[model samples]
Every structure is written in C-alpha cells, then in structure tokens.
Target: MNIVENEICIRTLIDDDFPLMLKWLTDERVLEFYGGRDKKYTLESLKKHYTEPWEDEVFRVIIEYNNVPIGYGQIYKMYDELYTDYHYPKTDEIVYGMDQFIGEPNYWSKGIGTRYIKLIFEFLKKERNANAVILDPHKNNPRAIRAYQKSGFRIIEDLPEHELHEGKKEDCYLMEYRY
Candidate 1:
C-alpha cells in the first residue's frame, strides 16, 4: 500500500530495499532504542529476515520523506497472544500494533515522526477499520514517547522487563491511540 501526505510517503517494502535496511539496522543511532547497539545486520541476514511471505496480518512499509526513503515501519493486527502479553483489555474492538524507527539521523527531532504517525492513524482507521493502535517504547526513550504522545497516543501501563536490550531487560511503556 502506498500512502502519501504532503512530504511524507509510505509504501510496501520490497527485496530491493534490503540494502537500505542493512544501513539503518547497522547504525548505532537507529538501533539505540530499536535493537540495541550490538544488534547489527549483514546484507544476507537482512534479506533472510525481511524478505518475503510475511504473516497475512502484518503490513511492512518503508517511510519516505521528500521522496527519499528514511525509515521503516510495520503494522499488524493485535491477536490473542499480544493482547494478553500487553495486558490490553479484552474487547471486541479491533486493535493494531505498530513498530517503527526513523533510520536517518538527519531527520530526527524534525517533527516528521509525529506527522507521519498521524497520517498512519487515519490510514488505519479508514483503510483497515482499526479501533485503536498500540505501541511499546522503552521507558528511557523520552523522545519517542513524546512524539507518540503528540500524535495522540496515551500511556496505558508500564511493562517491566518488556524487552531485551544490550544483554539486559529494558522497561517499556505501553501506549495506545484509540480512534
């Protein structure tokens, strides 16, 4: 799916984009809050990881600004396991989970993340009939949390030992945006 809003664009990821992914995944700045500094990727490993038949409910995309690719993101339907693990209230509402990172350091703190995120909120509501969107950010990641808050997401709960980062468990905050 290709989505365009002003200078930001989101499009389906393809095998050709693996090189870009390699560059971003290997950079310390990009992985600082994403995968940790030690979690680097080789070209072959990246291809193996990202190439292909993704789960039917997952939609992975590349984020572009001014027509240049700058980051990556994925949106997926929240299933039973996710709901339970995240302590999300069980309801009939359709919820989606999203993960993203602005790989380009030059784009950091430019307010691009908030704008594109708001755009995605509309896309999820209109295109997928999503009732809400959820994301978990490391508690130490104030910048990302602030950006999410600006995009209409609210902190729901704290997740202790939510993720493994640099050989340690990192606390995270569960945030959600209800439509």
Candidate 2:
C-alpha cells in the first residue's frame, strides 16, 4: 500500500527494507528520540520483530521522500489499555494511534513530517472514518512537538513519566487531532 502527497510517500514495509531499517535504527540521531541510544538491533532481530503477519487494524509503512525511503511509521487502532492510558474520550468516537520517525537526519526540520502526517490524517479520515488520532511525544522534543502542532495536533495533557528512554522515565505530551 502507498499513500502519497507531493514529494512524500508512505508505502508498506517489506523484507527488502530491513537493511535500511537496520541502518536507521542503529543511528544515534534516529534513536535519540525513538529507541534509546543504547538500544541495538541486528538484521535477524529486526526481521523477527517485524515479520509477524499483518493485522487489519495496523499499518506499518516505509516513508519515502521524492522517491527515496527516508523513514518509518505505523498506525494502529486504539485498544482498551491504550485508550485508558492515553485518557481518550469514552464516547463512541473512533481513535487511531500513530508513531513515526524521520530516520534521515537531513530530513529534520524540512516540514516533511508535517506534510506526511497530514496525508496520513487524510487517509484515516477517508478510509477509516476516524474521529480522532493521538500521539505522544517526549516533552523535551521541541522539534517533533512543533511539527505535530503544524499538523493540527493540540496538546491535551501532560503525561508524567510516560516513557522510559535511555534509562530514565521521560515526560510526554499527549497530543490529539480531532476531525
């Protein structure tokens, strides 16, 4: 599957992309905000983690810019535990969760993240009849926060000690985009 908007394209993750994934996952710049800098992944381990059968409600994709793969992203429906943890509204609204990282440091601050997020928002709205989308970014990540804000996500709350990164619990901002 491919979702494209201008120079940004998001395509399904495939076996051939493992080497690229390995490269990205190992980069300190990429792992700084995502996995901890100390986290490591080999080709075999990476394949094992991503080779599971695809589920209808989850999407794992490779992000491409001007026809070159440059990042990775995933979208999944909010489950019970997640909904409760994120403090999502209890109404019958449909909510989807997303996480992404631009592995190529050169792509940082280029507004590509915002554009791709808008494209994904369009996809979720049209294809899934989504009512809202949520994501949590480390509070210290101003760059990502600004990008999400540009994509129309608003900070809903502060999640104290929300995630463990590089060994310590990190605060996060719960952001949401409601359609």
Candidate 3:
C-alpha cells in the first residue's frame, strides 16, 4: 500500500530496507525516546525482527518522502502471538506497533513525525479496516506523547515497566483509538 502526501508517503518495508532500518534504530537520539536505558538495538537483532512480521498478513511499513525511510509502524493479529500470552480478549484481533521512529535527528522538531504518523493511522483505518489502534509511548517523552495525542489517540491505560530499564520503572500510557 502507498500513501502519498506532499512531504511524505507511508508504505511497506522490503528486504532492501533492512540496512536503513538498522541505522535508524541504533541512532542515540532515536533510541533514547523509544528504547529504555538497557534496551540495546543491533543489526543482527533487527534483521531477525525485520523479516518476521511479513510472514503474517497484518504488519506494514511507513516509508516517508519518496525514498526516505523515516520511520516504521505496524498492525498484526495480536491474539495470534503475544496477545494470546497477555490474556487479552480474543476479539482484539488487531494490535498496533509504531515500535520505532528513526528519521534524521535534525528533523526531530520539524513536525514530519506528526504528519507521517497521522497519515499512516488514517490509512490503516480507512483502507485496512482496522477495528482499533493501540500504542505505548513513554510517559516522560513529551514530544512523542504529544504527537500520539494529536493523532487522535486517547489514553486507555498505563503499562508497568516490566523490568524494561536499569531498575527504573517507567510508565507507559496506552493510547488507543477505535474505529
């Protein structure tokens, strides 16, 4: 699927995108807001992750600005995997993940993240027939938190850190939007 905007486009990821995805995830600034202190991102780990979701029908990618691989997001059958373990409802079939954003550091405050994400979510709702959209953003990252809120998400619950960081428990605001 391709979503073209004046400054961006949201589309699917491919094998060629693997390297770019690795670079984006490892950048310090990008990782800081998304990954906690102890969560180390690496190419080998990412290569394993990058290819798995396509085995299923629901995961997707959002390519930005013609050829710029600015960020990544997704939707999958939550109940089929982790959701089953979480004991979430059987009917909550769709799970959303904007698990990373690695656009250029200089572009952090440029509002590109906002535009790209809003467009991607809208595409998911209108084109993909999503029942609901869910995401978890760190409560301390106001920049990302505000962007999620601006993109029509409202807080549904908070997630415990679950031993994510270096003995520091961070709260996750579960932002959700139902179609």
Candidate 4:
C-alpha cells in the first residue's frame, strides 16, 4: 500500500525493515497497549509473520510521517473460518479488520495515530470494496479509543470475550467504520 497526502504516507513492509520492527515490538512503551511488555518478540517470530506467503487477501505496511517509518498497520479480510475456533458468527458481508500501532514513542498523542487510522481505514474500504473496517482495541486505551472515534469508528459493544494482551486476557472495545 502506498498512500501519500502532504507529509504522511504508507508503504509495504520490506525485509530491511525487520530490525526497526523488532525494535518497536520489544519496546515496553510501544507494546504496553499490545500486552507485549515483558513478552519476547523475537526475530524468528517477526520473520514468520513479515516474511509472508504474499497472499492477496492481507497486507501489512509501514506508516510514514515525512518519509520516516513511525508505525505499522494491516488491512485484512475478516472471514468466519479464520475465527471458527473462537466461535464468532460468520458474516456474509465483505468485512475487513484493521490493526495498527505507533512504534515511535515520540509520535504518541500527537494526533498522528488518528490521521493514520482515517487514511488506512479509507484505503481499505476503497481498495478492497469493503463493507466496513473493523478493529478491537483494548478498552483501557482511552487515547486510542478517542483517536478511532475521530476517524468515524463507533463502538459496537464491549466484547464479552476477552482478547490476550501482555500474555493475559484483555477487555476490548469492538469498533467499526462502515462504508
């Protein structure tokens, strides 16, 4: 994905970006929201994920600010079979889910995340001809929740099922931006 308007942009993740990705993944400040604090995010793990099979249905990108990689985001199909183990109901609509984070701490609370969310969410809707862009952010992350709201994502509900973060079940707000 390549999106540029003024000084902001996003590009496909590359092999050379692994060290930077690893740096953020291991940072306690960065992983605080992801429950990665004190958890090991190894090079092998990242290789397994980033060095993908190049499937067309999902893609990851590095979020850029003035040509600098400051964060990451992914746009992916939300299929029922993928969640069959979780027992979430299957939907016929073309649903897409977004996951993202600001890896650079200096960029936090600077409205950068909000801007990135809106840009990427819209990109997914348009490029994929998607019906909606969904996300499940930790309920405790008021900062992120507010940013997503500014991007037109409304909370559908507090999911009864907890998601794991920091190696423990974490409460999350299931939110979406419908096309």
Candidate 5:
C-alpha cells in the first residue's frame, strides 16, 4: 500500500533497506521485541527476514522521515505454521505480523508509532483484502500498548507468563483489531 504524508511516508520494504534495518534491529527496544535467543543477526539473516519473503507476496511496513528511514511493521495472513502451532483458526483468519520500534530513540512518542499502525490497517484492508489484524505486544511495554489502543487496537487476550522473548520467557498480551 502507498501512503504519502509529510514527514513520514508508508511504503513496502525493499532489498536496499538492510543497512537501516540492521541498525534498527540492534536498538535495545527493537531487539527486545524481535530478537531471537542470543541471536546475532548478521547481514544475511537480515536479508532473509525482511526482504526475501516480500518478493513472493508479503506485506511489510516501513516509515521514512525526511528521506531517512525510521521504523518497520509487518502483516501476513494466518497459515498452517501458525494455526497448527497455536490452535488458532486454520483458515479464513487473517493475521498481522507486526513489530514496531522507533529507530531514532529521539523520535519516540513523537506520534509516528501510532501513525504507522493506522497506515498498516488501511493498507491491509484496502490493498490486501484482509478483515482483521492481530499482534502480540510484550506486556511490559506500556508505550506500545497505549499506542495500539490509540490506533484502535484492543486487547484480545491478557496472556500472562505465556511465552519467551529472546530466550527470556516473559508475559505478554495478545491484541487485535478489525479493519
């Protein structure tokens, strides 16, 4: 989906975004959300995670500010891997894969995070023919939860002690919204 606002523009991820993504993923906040166990993400892994799948039809959200990159978001429909693993609906249940972090810490709470989420929802419904979007936000991050709420997301499950983060198990809340 294409959306052009003033400072931040929402667009699809591209191969050349590796360097920016590498920096973003390494940030403390971003890492806590998407990083794996002792996972040292080399450039190769970055390519695989962000770019490769998009070529075959996956939707990723990226925000650009003043011609510089700032943050990313991802969305995908539910499939076997998710359904089988979680006992969620096996079909007709659209899912949103998202992890959002303000790469520029100085930019945090400037309202970009919430704006990007709204853009993603529009992109999913208008461009991808999807009905709902779902996401899991670590319970400890109140900023994230508040941002999601302001953007129209509501908690679907208050799952405590539910999963692990980068090998450190933690409680999380499942949140979602309809488009």
Candidate 6:
C-alpha cells in the first residue's frame, strides 16, 4: 500500500482518503499555483477526478511525509485521454506525463519535492516502461522548476501561454527527463 524510500512514502490514493485531499485543495497556500480559490474546486469535482475508473495507463499516488499524507502525484501515458490536449514530440513512442503538488506548507523547500520526483521517475521508468517523462510547470514557479531541474528534468521548450491560474494566463515550461 506504500512505497517507503528513505524519508518519504507514496501510496495509491483511495476513495476513503478524499477528505484529506480536499483539505489541501482548499488551503490557500496549497492552491496558490493551482488556479487558487477563484477556481472553486469543490470536493465533488475532486472526487470525480480521483474516484473514477482508470485504465492501466494511469496511476494516482498519495505522497506522505513522516507517515502523514502531505501531497498528491499522478503519471499517465502521454497519449492517454486525460492528456489529449498536450502534444508530445513523438506521437508513436511511449512517453509519460507527470504532475504533482505538495499540500503541506511545512514541507516546502526542504528537499521533499526533489526526493519524491526522483522516486517517481524510477517508478515511471521501471513500472510504466516510459521512454521519457515530462511535465509543464507554470513558468512563474521557480522553486518548483528548480526542484524538478535538480531531479534531472531540463527545459525542452518554453510554452508562451498555457493554463490559467489565479485569473491570469500563465506561461509554461515544457520539461523532460529521459532515460
């Protein structure tokens, strides 16, 4: 039910844990880069995203710090229906897309993100058979981008405009880590 490697643990997100996830989603600090309070991300909507039946290509995981759930992460096939909008460079190869957020403010800037990313990258490379792992972080989130870079991701390209967060269009950086 969990992956314990050094200081962090990761496990599959279960339906019963929705309330824990909801608490983080509603926190201003946690939601800062994720569209914020204006987006009105309700529990019902989040339940829909997490509880739905998923194909073998998608994996959603809960991140734990000191045995307590503190974040969430997901990885899916690049061509999966969930990511129909983002285009990968290779249409025929097996690339994977990853996304994650740390909900606990106390864990910020403490190397937790970097460790989680490195572990997840191993999971993707081994378990998912991924040729390359990719992500797009809002261009303004330098802390997150730096953490990702430390975990072996490099900026592949700069996407001038992407998702909207906190009422403004945010620039994106397409980052990738290849085996």
Q: Which lDDT tens digits does candidate 4 get at residues 1-179? A: 78897878888888888888999999989888754687686888877876666334777889889888898887778866434532445566677777888899899889998888778767866777777777888888899899989888899767654677756777777887885
Query: For candidate 6, lDDT tens digit of each residue in 96-151?
Result: 77889889899899999999988877877677677788899998899989998999
lDDT for predicted candidate 1 compared with the true structure:
0.89
Q: lDDT scores for all predictions?
A: 0.89, 0.89, 0.66, 0.78, 0.72, 0.81
Ranking by TM-score: 1, 2, 6, 4, 5, 3
Candidate 5, which segments miss by more than 4 Å at Cα? 36-38, 51-57, 84-95
Once fitted onto the true fold, the runs of candidate 4 whose alpha carbons sit more than 4 angstroms away are: 52-56, 81-92
Task: Please give the range of 10 consecutive residues that has the lowest summed lDDT in model 3.
Answer: 79-88
TM-scores of all predicted structures: 0.95, 0.94, 0.78, 0.88, 0.82, 0.89
Candidate 2, which segments miss by more than 4 Å at Cα?
52-56
Name model 3 segments beyond 4 Å from true.
Answer: 36-42, 53-56, 80-97, 166-169
Give candidate 1 misplaced runs (Cα > 4 Å): 52-56
Greater-lDDT candidate between 3 and 5:
5
| Candidate 5 lDDT by residue in tens digits, 108-135 | 7888888788877777777677666767
Kindly state the number of residue pairs that clash in model 4: 1
Which pairs clash inside model 2? none
- lDDT value, candidate 3, whole model: 0.66
Error (Å) of candidate 5 at residue 129 is 3.4
Candidate 2 vs candidate 3, lDDT winner: 2
Question: Model 5 misses residue 40 by how many Å?
Answer: 1.9
TM-score of 6: 0.89
**Count of backbone clashes, every candidate in sequence:** 0, 0, 0, 1, 0, 0
